[PDB]
Amino acid sequence: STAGKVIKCKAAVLWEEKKPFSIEEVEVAPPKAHEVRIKMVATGICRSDDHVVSGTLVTPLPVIAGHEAAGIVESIGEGVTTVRPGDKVIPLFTPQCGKCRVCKHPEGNFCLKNDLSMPRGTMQDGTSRFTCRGKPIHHFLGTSTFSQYTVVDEISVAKIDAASPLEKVCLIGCGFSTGYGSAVKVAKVTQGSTCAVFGLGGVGLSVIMGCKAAGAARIIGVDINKDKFAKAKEVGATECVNPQDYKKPIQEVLTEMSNGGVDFSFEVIGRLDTMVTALSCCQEAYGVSVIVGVPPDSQNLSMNPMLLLSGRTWKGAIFGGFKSKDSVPKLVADFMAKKFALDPLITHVLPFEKINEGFDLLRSGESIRTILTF
Amino acid sequence: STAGKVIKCKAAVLWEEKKPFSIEEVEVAPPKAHEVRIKMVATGICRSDDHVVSGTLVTPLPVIAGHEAAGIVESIGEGVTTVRPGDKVIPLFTPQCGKCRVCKHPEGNFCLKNDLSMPRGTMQDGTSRFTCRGKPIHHFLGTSTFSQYTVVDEISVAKIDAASPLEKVCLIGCGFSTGYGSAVKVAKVTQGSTCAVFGLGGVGLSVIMGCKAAGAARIIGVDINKDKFAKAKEVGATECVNPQDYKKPIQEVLTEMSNGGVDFSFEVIGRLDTMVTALSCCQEAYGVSVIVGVPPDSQNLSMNPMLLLSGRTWKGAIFGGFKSKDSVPKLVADFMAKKFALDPLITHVLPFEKINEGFDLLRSGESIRTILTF
Ligand SMILES: NC(=O)c1c[nH+]cc([C@@H]2O[C@H](COP(=O)([O-])OP(=O)(O)OC[C@H]3O[C@@H](n4cnc5c(N)ncnc54)[C@H](O)[C@@H]3O)[C@@H](O)[C@H]2O)c1
Ligand SMILES: NC(=O)c1c[nH+]cc([C@@H]2O[C@H](COP(=O)([O-])OP(=O)(O)OC[C@H]3O[C@@H](n4cnc5c(N)ncnc54)[C@H](O)[C@@H]3O)[C@@H](O)[C@H]2O)c1
Ligand SMILES: [Zn+2]
Ligand SMILES: [Zn+2]
Ligand SMILES: [Zn+2]
Ligand SMILES: [Zn+2]
Secondary structure, eight states: OOOSSOEEEEEEEBOSTTSOOEEEEEEEOOOOTTEEEEEEEEEEOOHHHHHHHHTSSOOOSSEEOOOOEEEEEEEEOTTOOSOOTTOEEEEOSSOOOSSSHHHHSSSOOOOTTOSSSSOOOSOTTSOOOEEETTEEEEESTTTOOSBSEEEEEGGGEEEOOTTOOHHHHGGGGTHHHHHHHIIIIIIOOOTTOEEEEEOOSHHHHHHHHHHHHTTOSEEEEEOSOGGGHHHHHHTTOSEEEOGGGOSSOHHHHHHHHTTSOBSEEEEOSOOHHHHHHHHHTBOTTTOEEEEOSOOOTTOOEEEOTHHHHTTOEEEEOSGGGOOHHHHHHHHHHHHHTTSSOOGGGEEEEEEGGGHHHHHHHHHHTSOSEEEEEO | OOOSSOEEEEEEEBOSTTSOOEEEEEEEOOOOTTEEEEEEEEEEOOHHHHHHHHTSSOOOSSEEOOOSEEEEEEEEOTTOOSOOTTOEEEEOSSOOOSSSTTTTSSSOOSOTTOSSSSOOSSOTTSOOOEEETTEEEEESTTTOOSBSEEEEEGGGEEEOOTTOOHHHHGGGGTHHHHHHHIIIIIIOOOTTOEEEEEOOSHHHHHHHHHHHHHTOSEEEEEOSOGGGHHHHHHHTOSEEEOGGGOSSOHHHHHHHHTTSOBSEEEEOSOOHHHHHHHHHTBOTTTOEEEEOSOOOTTOOEEEOTHHHHHTOEEEEOSGGGOOHHHHHHHHHHHHHTTSSOOGGGEEEEEEGGGHHHHHHHHHHTOOSEEEEEO
């Protein structure tokens, strides 16, 4: 609660890979010049947080993962000008300093002040703000939402409507924005088109939501988990296909289904094989393929360049192509006006303490988005 | 010679790979329904015809190669309505049937009636038209321009200006159009942008040409052949770099001089390695890399997908994204209106009979385009 000095609270520390999270008592230091201390309220568990544990996404340990949340400004640091104490807010794993090359660029959004290309696991000061035992804990994407209190650089935080249901709205901190943005912003799905979405998780279902918004005619969901097909159909999919039901490669199935290939295909899983399969399944001469999922640390993929030479465009995108600060509050507003629904993504809600259970639900396949409340 | 039946003439037949062309006598058969027989006046030597001789580009031998040329209609077949005997024309290696899904699509240009994805070496009806010695000979991309006379289907021929200079306009058959289109049409170079072009041959120089037309503020040329530089700077290049002069990876070099990467890179050589180096050297969040060169048959390239996750867009294109039949006439017009110059690309003009010498020049590095005359 209240402060101007070190706060002691509970956080979900990950000490080693492939191990459960240890909810421990951490000392969260006060915000410095241009930083804000936020009292967390809810956090969605995304597969990227899971990649940290399984070691697919290399970032320094010990660490406090988490990047999809909504909280409340507990205090403000020297120089802050964009938020104030008591303000509802959303941390931003993709920052927007407003000064670098990309921020200037009217299209690019992968801000040069991010901690994703080369994780230091720090505050921009190059310092940590957490300590457990006596040891300093790293930050994740300068967000670290698996904690009652976290401190973010102003560059990495966005003010949201005071009437927002922080428990719903946290999905806009990643899952929905990344997925919905891939469809509408990065691939620019056209009306009457035909799309194919590989991966029916919380981000994948969001991509389907975006294709429906963008007026697509057919939305083919693809997943090796038949159970996902209901939600997929409920949020827009015109049909779902399970690769395992077939005796021929899914590209062939998809091309034939779409008489020649899909207009837009999306990879929202994170593995080398589906990325290429998704590319190949779209129309050879003008199909667009967008890589949305996060692949394993240092793995290369092999592909035949003639796939491109014909006329195919392959892209990738972080955070749905959205300029972070500008977009999250505008998105939250659209939610408020009821232009899209988040409920369909939310399968579970557990108290933060049951964090490990939420990840088990993820990994087992019974959940889409499980929200942890504080 | 005029006619209504077989015309016995001369041509360069490639009987076996990695062997010179044999200039000999072939029998060119009269055009069937919707076919046009054409008397050739001039042809350019592109690297793709060399790929055929090297076996890098697989197409059934024996074959009569050649894809960039211009000539005059000697005769037409039953049902033709878009050309007449006496008309100047350019045979299109990328057809435009106007009926298929790609042709009806606003941006696609790779017609579904092309003989490039699965090369049969024939004509629309699956039958040849050339006989040498006594055995039938194959067609190349439906054009086969290294012959005094050839036959093409109505969908692979465009009528051009009756006043156009054929030993010039023949470069629009491939080299210019494909290179100019890659910049202007495919990548869509923006004014003020920083471009990079790997490979300074006829096709590369034309890409430079288009970048200038697009308003590129910086256009860097990369080549291991130092002697190409002058002609590059001459047609638009601002700088020229020779990878072999540095002790560090070319992408490091290119990313530093462009302060974090170029806006648009083009691969116009045809190698797996440079298609990746071109991709990496462009800005991570919004850079665009276009593949123009033709890779070796069934070779795959390895690459790290994070490159795309950042925000980069990778594309490829045939004939510069140009819908063949309607664009070629319009491009010839712009030539007539002095909108662009083809003269800097032409370093030699040899008699058709000296086709071998032309190829040797190409291969020795001291040529850009050699025009062969009939
Ligand atoms: N680009 C970004 O900004 C970004 C942000 N957050 C998450 C991501 C990534 O997106 C990916 C999805 O995240 P999520 O929705 O939270 O994940 P979630 O794990 O809920 O969904 C993954 C889905 O893919 C399915 N799947 C797995 N293997 C296959 C397969 N081989 N073939 C077909 N289907 C398969 C699986 O059944 C599951 O439903 C993951 O890699 C996550 O790290 C990217
Ligand atoms: N996409 C299409 O529709 C299309 C049509 N025709 C040809 C092409 C292809 O375009 C490519 C170029 O044609 P071209 O302009 O006739 O060939 P040309 O040989 O004239 O150009 C090749 C140039 O690349 C240079 N080069 C070689 N190695 C390197 C290297 N390692 N690094 C940098 N530069 C290098 C080389 O010195 C030469 O200057 C070729 O691969 C051809 O097969 C594409
Ligand atoms: Zn995420
Ligand atoms: Zn920035
Ligand atoms: Zn060519
Ligand atoms: Zn067509």
